Amino acid sequence: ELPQMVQQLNSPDQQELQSALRKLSQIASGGNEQIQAVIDAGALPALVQLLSSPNEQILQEALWALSNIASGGNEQIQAVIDAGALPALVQLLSSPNEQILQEALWALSNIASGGNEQIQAVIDAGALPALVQLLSSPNEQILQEALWALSNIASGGNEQKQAVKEAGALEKLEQLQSHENEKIQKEAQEALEKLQS
């Protein structure tokens, strides 16, 4: 019934659209075969379009589905990138809605867990200045997520590491070694270790 669910993401009926979205999200949270089923059904272009929704509930569920898909294999990560999700995802890092922000962060972190070229796609989409700004968040959950995302990027190749340094991450990471939260100090230190020569 996947193609019918995907067709419903066009429903003039917001209730029908949201129902279908919730179910696709559920399926995408399964294993890699489940994710591939959702991708094969053509869900990705629809999900990416829904990132433009002014309805924040629809937005949140679309992000949940995309983050799930991005948690699959490198080919499934590649499908999300090829569908053009990245610019909208990076834009959402500046949402005043912190729940939407966190979900976009999850998706980007999952993408940045892929190959060096997938990491480079995240950087090319403008993620670094947005992520570095998030290191200033007073919300420790957001801070930790941004730290994890930057750490994933910093786990890439030399070209990726160099981009992180050029975005000014080194200063803030060193400052965070004095953060009141010991877990944050630790995660910042490890990111610095990855960037070190």
Sequence length of the chain is 197
Report how far residue 101's alpha carbon sits from residue 76's, in angstroms, rounded to the nearest whole number: 22
Q: Which amino acid is at 172?
A: K
**Joined tokens for residue 116:** 């060096």
What residues make up the domain containing 184?
A: 1-197
Q: Specify the number of domains making up the chain.
A: 1
Cβ contacts of residue 85 below 8 Å, gap of 6+?
44, 47, 48, 51, 66, 107
Cβ contacts of residue 197 below 8 Å, gap of 6+?
none
Report how far residue 48's alpha carbon sits from residue 43's, in angstroms, rounded to the nearest whole number: 9
Name the DSSP letter for residue 12. S
**Joined tokens for residue 86:** 């990245």
Report how far residue 72's alpha carbon sits from residue 14's, in angstroms, rounded to the nearest whole number: 28
**Joined tokens for residue 11:** 């429903």
Contact at 8 Å (CB) between 57 and 23? Answer: no
52 three-class SS: coil
Report how far residue 28's alpha carbon sits from residue 34's, in angstroms, rounded to the nearest whole number: 6
Name the DSSP letter for residue 13. -
Report how far residue 150's alpha carbon sits from residue 161's, in angstroms, rounded to the nearest whole number: 10
* CATH at residue 145: 1.25.10.10
- Rg (alpha carbons) of the chain, rounded to whole number: 17
| Structural determination approach | X-ray
**Joined tokens for residue 90:** 């990076």
Contact at 8 Å (CB) between 62 and 51? Answer: yes
Q: Residue 152: which of 180, 89, 194 has the closest Cα?
A: 194
**Joined tokens for residue 138:** 């007073």
Contact at 8 Å (CB) between 121 and 111? Answer: yes
Q: Please note each residue after which the chain is broken, C-to-N distance over 2.5 A, or write none.
A: none
Q: In the chain, what's the furthest Cα-to-Cα distance?
A: 56
Report how far residue 167's alpha carbon sits from residue 164's, in angstroms, rounded to the nearest whole number: 5
Resolution (A): 1.8
Cβ contacts of residue 137 below 8 Å, gap of 6+?
143, 146
